[PDB]
Amino acid sequence: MEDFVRQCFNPMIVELAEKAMKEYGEDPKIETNKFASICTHLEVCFMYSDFHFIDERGESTIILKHRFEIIEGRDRTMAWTVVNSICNTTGVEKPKFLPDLYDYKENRFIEIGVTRREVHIYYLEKANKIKSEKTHIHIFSFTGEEMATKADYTLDEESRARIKTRLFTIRQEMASRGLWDSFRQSERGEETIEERFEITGTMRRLADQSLPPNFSSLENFRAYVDGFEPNGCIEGKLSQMSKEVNARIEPFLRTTPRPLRLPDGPPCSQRSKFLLMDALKLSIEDPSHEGEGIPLYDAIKCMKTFFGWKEPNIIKPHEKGINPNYLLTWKQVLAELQDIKNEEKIPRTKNMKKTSQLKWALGENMAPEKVDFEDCKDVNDLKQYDSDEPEPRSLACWIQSEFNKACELTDSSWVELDEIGEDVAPIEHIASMRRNYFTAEVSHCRATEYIMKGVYINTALLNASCAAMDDFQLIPMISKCITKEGRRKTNLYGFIIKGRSHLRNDTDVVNFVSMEFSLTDPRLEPHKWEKYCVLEIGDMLLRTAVGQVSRPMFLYVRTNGTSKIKMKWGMEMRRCLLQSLQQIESMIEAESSVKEKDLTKEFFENKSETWPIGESPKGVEEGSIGKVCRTLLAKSVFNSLYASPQLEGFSAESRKLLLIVQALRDNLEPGTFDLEGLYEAIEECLINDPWVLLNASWFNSFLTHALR
């Protein structure tokens, strides 16, 4: 019968039928009575719809509008979409199930049926299944019988006769094949198929090779596991195991811990991106807010305020560099500033000429040429990149001085926070007054000046690197402050020349040459300035209380480098504030949860409460809440400036030792399993970073003070 059905229909009809039956997941070669029934349904429906159009007025047309719209022979999604659209636009309520087609003249859905059985039986079956009263139902019979609702035939007598003739002739052909009797239609049973997932072939071999040593097949292991019952296996193996496998608790007493062993070597040197305690700024009273005017114009104005320029000369040469190049770089900066001055038009940015001194100082053409391995394998000195440990350095006394100076109060405010919404809630008023206290204590801290300087420098560097990756750009180091008299000041620290910045990776380096003003003689602490070439560029007549004293003014010139990640994290240094303040807040709130009142005003205006925050030869020194806030701010800022993997490792490892010491202080009887390993892990992180070395020294001092 498959040949009879396939050869006795339009290829399109059979294609639609087979797609429709496949949509259910059935096998066409298995079930074919369903195939015959659905193909007959498709044919009769297509004859019903075909040869029927509607003219402009809305009357019949026999050979433009299509009188009938087909629903069968389509994916459930498309049929549902079309029926829903028709029901929405025409207004006729859609039926619960899927009809066979739709008629526009009478505007209703009609169902078509072809059955060997008598018309009445199938008519009743479909009518009581769909249970719809506004959808037409038409039933056909293989013997020429036919009937629709209320005996009302929608299609013309000629169309009904043609459909009957087609049905009769196809039935005669099927009977000629002889399978007409053994057809009896077919109904949808909605079978359920159980799943299966077999492991065979290569994967079975892999499974057989992925079992404990004593098993040869996956099935054997599965059988062993299924028939497994716990019989003292763990206890027997614990008895068998050697007694050397144990976790022996070592009592941690006051005499147990020892000071950390700091590395030995040459003293550490400065590695920040700008001067911190030795920075000197030329200031001009300008009534503008942060980042308002042109940086170059402000730099020129600040330079004008200083008289006493002197012919530059090397004072502290860079040991591994070419100092004459640094001298020439400073001279070129002065010349370019003069050129922009005598221009009567100040551009937003200045591009420095690519002279030999700047080419060397900015690392021009220092990257080795990239070649294929097959072209250089025979080179005698071709070898792996140097990947040794960084050389060790001993802690120096200048980092402690830097931190001490970073915790001081300044005579000028350094942070001008933005506005926020007005206070409406009492808690918001309390928060506002608390934040006023905080920002008053923090606005005048040198650490805040460092924050602002770093944010500005990193922002300028990143913007210049992205905007002009092929130019040597000049950038003034400019800050804005408010003096104790309320007068706004613009300060110039120095200049930075940014080199080529074709930064691809987040760790790719852009070089720059930084020249910063200062008043500190390098020769007092040469080891701190190993990376610098310090010049003398004038004698400034400082105004001291007694009178006026002339002192040399130095230019610390060095080559430094920064990456995209470092610049980005330097642009976000302001969040450091948050850290400190949060720590302060929780300290007040905790004490305010016992007294049932806010002690912020008490803490900030009476200084009755103090916390140990420093060390003096007489002993431990205690400071006020404001001093603690400034100290925590300075610690966060220095963490930002001196970030390194060594700091991260030291923090992570020393946290555990701090917690153990605290547990000892709480009388909780701490115990360690391997304290020597912990000490080794802590010590492996101290190599050459001055900040990490200072933190380790602080930990040693705290250990000495916390166990007596």
């Binding site: 109060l409 205006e605 404001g626």
Partner: peptide, 7 residues
Amino acid sequence: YSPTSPS
């Protein structure tokens, strides 16, 4: 508020 420190 005017911050002040002994040092």
